[PDB]
A paper describes a structure:
GuxA is a multi-modular and multi-functional enzyme from Acidothermus cellulolyticus whose catalytic domains include a xylanase/endoglucanase GH12 and an exoglucanase GH6, representing a unique combination of these two glycoside hydrolase families in a single CAZyme. GuxA on the other hand contains an N-terminal GH6 domain linked to a CBM3 followed by a GH12 catalytic domain linked to a CBM2 on the C-terminal end. GuxA shows an optimal temperature range between 75 and 80 °C for all three substrates, which is well above the optimal growth temperature of 55 °C for A. cellulolyticus.
The domain exhibits the classic GH12 β-jelly roll, with two curved β-sheets packed together-their concave face forming the active site-and one α-helix. The active site cavity is lined with aromatic residues that accommodate the substrate without any significant change in structure at the local or whole-protein level—The Cα RMSD between the structures with and without cellobiose bound is 0.166 Å. The reducing end of the bound cellobiose is sandwiched between two loops formed by residues Thr59-Pro63 and Val142-Phe145, and primarily contacts the peptide backbone atoms of these residues. Glu131 and Glu216 are the catalytic residues (the nucleophile and the general acid/base, respectively), whereas the strictly conserved active site aspartate residue is at position 114.
Numbering used by the authors: 2 to 241
Write the structure that this text describes.
């Protein structure tokens, strides 16, 4: 069925299990109490920002990051066919696809948020790397830190790379150039190898989760997720 979740931030997070709890959709209004509603299809995992009209500047922190994820966010973990936590260096393959709905108004990014951590579990802020993958953005926002590379080829696409330092973790943001509304079979293992070559990622870290959604500074109504998949593997074959 379809569920609507308007859980107000900044201190509450409304989390909805979709597709047999292979994915969770979170309101995650971590920096605002302004109205934000998500409408979520629990059979398909499709979701929309059905009500939002954020107000504020385009600099600094966004208001919110409503998102879908596989894995663990601040100890809230999916439970079907997860494949995480896993040491980065032990991944056989890691692939994701995301199809979005965008609006030509407001100030937002359309981004993956991928967390790594020194230990396989945490109840809070991961301490390794935050890997962001910006499919698109508008309204004057930019990534955290500084732009350190322009027009590089990684995992079959062209990016600008931004690197920064947070209070207890490193951030690297891959900005698809030009931006787009979807990406198909993105090789995250290739992104991790690149992030490690650029000095942003320790491949001994555990991959905790793969999230996708919208950091919103202004507006936000009508942004959505049409389809989302993440597959992280190896171990070994064994029909039993
Ligand atoms: O505050 C975390 C937030 O930073 C965002 O980037 C800021 C940047 O740090 C600031 O120097 C510049 O003035 O504004 C941008 C936003 O436009 C980053 O985009 C977010 O991913 C991150 O959550
Ligand atoms: Cl920085
Ligand atoms: Na599945
Ligand atoms: Na602001
Ligand atoms: Zn959160
Ligand atoms: Zn961040
Ligand atoms: Zn491309
Ligand atoms: Zn493309
Ligand atoms: Zn690869």
């Amino acid at each position: 069925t379809t569920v609507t979740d308007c859980t107000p931030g900044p201190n509450q997070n409304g989390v909805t299990s979709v597709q047999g709890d292979e994915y969770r959709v979170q309101t995650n209004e971590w920096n605002s109490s302004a109205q934000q509603c998500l409408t979520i299809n629990t059979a398909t995992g499709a979701w929309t920002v059905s009500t939002a009209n954020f107000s504020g500047g385009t600099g600094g922190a966004p208001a919110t990051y409503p998102s879908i994820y596989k894995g663990c966010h601040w100890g809230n973990c999916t439970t079907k066919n997860v494949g995480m936590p896993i040491q980065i260096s032990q991944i056989g393959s890691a692939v994701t696809s995301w199809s979005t709905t965008q609006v030509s108004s407001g100030a937002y990014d359309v981004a993956y948020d991928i967390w790594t951590n020194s230990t396989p579990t945490t109840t809070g802020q991961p301490n390794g790397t935050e890997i962001m993958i910006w499919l698109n953005s508008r309204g004057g926002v930019q990534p955290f830190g500084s732009q350190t590379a322009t027009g590089v080829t990684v995992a079959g696409h062209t990016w600008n790379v931004w690197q920064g330092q947070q209070t207890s973790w490193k951030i690297i943001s891959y900005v698809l150039t030009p931006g787009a509304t979807s990406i198909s079979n993105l090789d995250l293992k290739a992104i991790f190898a690149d992030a490690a070559a650029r000095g942003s990622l320790n491949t001994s870290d555990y991959l905790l989760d793969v999230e996708a959604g919208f950091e919103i500074w202004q507006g936000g109504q009508g942004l959505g997720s049409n389809s989302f998949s993440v597959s992280v593997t190896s171990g070994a074959s064994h029909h039993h």
